Structure 1
Amino acid sequence: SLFKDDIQLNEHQVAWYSKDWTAVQSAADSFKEKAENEFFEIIGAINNKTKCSIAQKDYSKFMVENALSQFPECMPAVYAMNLIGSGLSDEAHFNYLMAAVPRGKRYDSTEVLIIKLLAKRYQVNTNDAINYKSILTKNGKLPLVLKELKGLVTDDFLKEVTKNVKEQKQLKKLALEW
């Protein structure tokens, strides 16, 4: 591009050939299945009783547990996995549910910022800090405190919130609508 009649060179060639590894690294990353699609992929197997394995997959004991608890027919097994579920292999806790719940069919970040924000300013727990968001959003509407306390957003502070570009998106969001 600046050489007209170049050949083709897909995303992957350009990466690997030039040796910037962030593109290669991102080139690897793009191929992998979307987290949300995996979480859906799994829940349906237990349910509709179809094949799949994990360990090729991201697994939240919570998610399956929660998502499952939805149908009162599942609830007995969700319980056992609840009391007992600790220290079972993510893989085991998978196979319990599999041969356990018989039939089938099936059908915060931003707030965390606000909250861990509020507790740090007033030196209080994450418990009142919920009640503090409440007492404001209703009353006083609290963009007005979101105004004083936009002040402390420091870059270091973002890392305790979340681990990714999702954080610097927030950086601005709160520099914004108040």
Structure 2
Amino acid sequence: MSLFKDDIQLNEHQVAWYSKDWTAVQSAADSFKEKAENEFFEIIGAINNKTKCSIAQKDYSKFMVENALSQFPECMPAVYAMNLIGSGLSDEAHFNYLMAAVPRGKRYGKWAKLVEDSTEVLIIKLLAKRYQVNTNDAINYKSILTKNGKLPLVLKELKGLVTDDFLKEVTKNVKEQKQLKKLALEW
């Protein structure tokens, strides 16, 4: 508890850099990370209502953008085309195509939902894997646990079988590490 009564403040960045606590330095640097909600809101706003937004440092997620734009059938053909052929396109190229294709509108993303709705397929998949039941029975079990059984309680132990090899079948890419940490803490 600071043996020394130093008048130097060491404002949470001096302590991280002077002490060479590279973990603390990384935490301090991430302290300037814009929360994903507003980054995604800006990206989807640029895509939906044509706006001068550039993604160079933004953590652009192809899957998040596609499944937040697919809620609307108006911009479904663009999402479908970038689903078929988007894989392999540079994130900038994917964003440019979505900008040029997605016609216009506001669409009111509601990022709070599409984050959980994007994990529904993964939950069904690993719940059918753990219980060795078909995906229909997996969704039935998921619905049952939401009411009785405390689905989080099951997921606490279920997290142990989300292997790096298992996630490959859920989606084919290297950004699948997002749900690795997402399901790394499910409690």
TM range (shorter): 0.5 to 0.7
Cα distance change of structure 1 residues 13 and 163 upon mapping to structure 2, 3 Å threshold:
farther
Residue by residue over 1:84-104, the C-alpha shift from the partner in whole angstroms, topping out at 9 and shown as x without a partner, is 323222221110111222322
Query: How many Å separate the matches in 2 of 1:164 and 1:94?
Result: 17
Query: How many Å separate the matches in 1 of 2:138 and 2:122?
Result: 11
Instruction: Tell me if structure 1 keeps the 8 A contact 2:78–2:102.
Output: yes
Query: How many Å separate the matches in 2 of 1:131 and 1:143?
Result: 16
Of 129, 137, 153, the match for 1:128: 137
The Cα of 1:34 is off from its aligned counterpart by 1.6
Residue by residue over 1:156-175, the C-alpha shift from the partner in whole angstroms, topping out at 9 and shown as x without a partner, is 99999999999999999999
Cα distance change of structure 1 residues 64 and 127 upon mapping to structure 2, 3 Å threshold:
same
Structure showing greater radius of gyration is 1
Deviates more, 1:100-109 or 1:42-51: 100-109
Instruction: Tell me if structure 1 keeps the 8 A contact 2:49–2:106.
Output: yes
Query: How many Å separate the matches in 2 of 1:168 and 1:91?
Result: 20
Structure 2 unmatched runs, 5+: 109-116
The Cα of 1:18 is off from its aligned counterpart by 2.0
Matched, 1:39 2:4: no
Cα distance change of structure 1 residues 59 and 158 upon mapping to structure 2, 3 Å threshold:
closer
What secondary structure is seen at the aligned counterpart in 2 of 1:130? helix
Deviates more, 1:124-133 or 1:93-102: 124-133
The Cα of 1:41 is off from its aligned counterpart by 1.4
What is the CA RMSD across the aligned residues, in angstroms?
Answer: 6.3
Query: How many Å separate the matches in 1 of 2:172 and 2:33?
Result: 19
Residue by residue over 1:112-151, the C-alpha shift from the partner in whole angstroms, topping out at 9 and shown as x without a partner, is 9987886676555666444444466668889999999999
Number of residue pairs the alignment of both structures matches: 178
TM-score by length of 2: 0.60
Cα distance change of structure 1 residues 165 and 34 upon mapping to structure 2, 3 Å threshold:
farther
Cα distance change of structure 1 residues 87 and 22 upon mapping to structure 2, 3 Å threshold:
closer
Deviates more, 1:17-26 or 1:92-101: 17-26
TM-score by length of 1: 0.63
Q: How high is the sequence identity, in percent, across the aligned residues?
A: 100
